[PDB]
Amino acid sequence: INLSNKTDENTISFFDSGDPERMNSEALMRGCGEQIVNLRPLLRTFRTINDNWSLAANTKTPITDLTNTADAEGRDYMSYLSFLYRFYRGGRRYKFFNTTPLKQSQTCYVRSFLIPRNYTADEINTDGPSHITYPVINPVHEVEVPFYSQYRKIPIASTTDKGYDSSLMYYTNVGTQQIVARAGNDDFTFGWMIGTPQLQGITKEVAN
């Protein structure tokens, strides 16, 4: 025997099993019907970040007021996955499903504008491209925000600069309650892969 502490790279598998891809594809054909191989498709899907987002009439609201919490929560895929990465690029898509339980005026209309990220409504004009819907004939306001950036990538941290990428401003002539679902455009993605954070599970109250 020779005195040494080394590494021989010994590897072992425990069963004389068939090709894993064969078995996996059979199992998918028999019990899933589809195959998820990448996590960008999940950014292409729409998932809910709030079932009840109340607005005040005649008020230009930036959606940051909501996303700044919906990103730390981790309920949607754009948030859950962001905790694995440090960068992102590309645009975003938002859908607003009307849930208003009262008639406020003979004509309810919804309007969306652009706005630089982290700005206030008193810091930006209402010109530029816009989208308008009428919740009574179309209760779903679908809109897309491009990647209008001074930078090729955007970090998920705080910066010294402000207004370096575009966002959404939301306006309504009445008090509307909406289900908000977001997603990424066909060009959104994330950057570095980093470690995971800790996950929160069931909570209980106990009157010790």
Binding site: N5, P155, I156, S158, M193, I194, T196, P197
Partner: protein, 248 residues
Amino acid sequence: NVHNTKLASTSAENAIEKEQITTFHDVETPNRIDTPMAQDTSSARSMDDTHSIIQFLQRPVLIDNIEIVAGTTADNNTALSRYVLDRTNPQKYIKQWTLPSTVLKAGGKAQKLANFKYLRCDVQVKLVLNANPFIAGRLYLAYSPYDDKVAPERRIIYTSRAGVTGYPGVELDFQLDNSVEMTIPYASFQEAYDLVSGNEDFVQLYLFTIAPVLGPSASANSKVDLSVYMWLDNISLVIPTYRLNPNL
């Protein structure tokens, strides 16, 4: 015709000369007295090659030198924790290095960056470890971008051992890997680092303790000594200026 003397005379009536930074415009080609049949009467070109600024910045620099001792129960020997429930009980590290400032402020590199504005660089890191064959242990060297500017719930601190080890890093065992080399790429979301206005760091390097130093139940010999070396890679200094970073 004559020697050692430039005689005042006319010349072409539109002269533009460019010397490596500056551009001169003169009414006429200047009268120039240069040396006839000049030769190099030195031997410097025979002693070594002339090193560019890039080469100067690719020079390894000693940044830190750590000495971990067994049975200290200090942050340098406190092992990485399984869970992190509170920010009052974060993951403890041996050392931390804010990059790239940590290297620019070391080895006399700031003197060669002065009078420049923008920089794209990859940071190259090297640890060298020494421990008697009777001492064991393991460390994890990892880098976290924007760890000092991102929310705490996203920091490499305030997460778990599994998360930490999920960050990019290298295993550093005492009896298998006495030396490890790490490469951190250009980390700014910008097109280049600003050396004058934006005094900022974009990636933080951490040295974590997986297993504490394991030695006999002795003394002064149960210990491990490390030394960190740093330099730059894939460099580009482009735009000159007259301004400086007082922070060098």
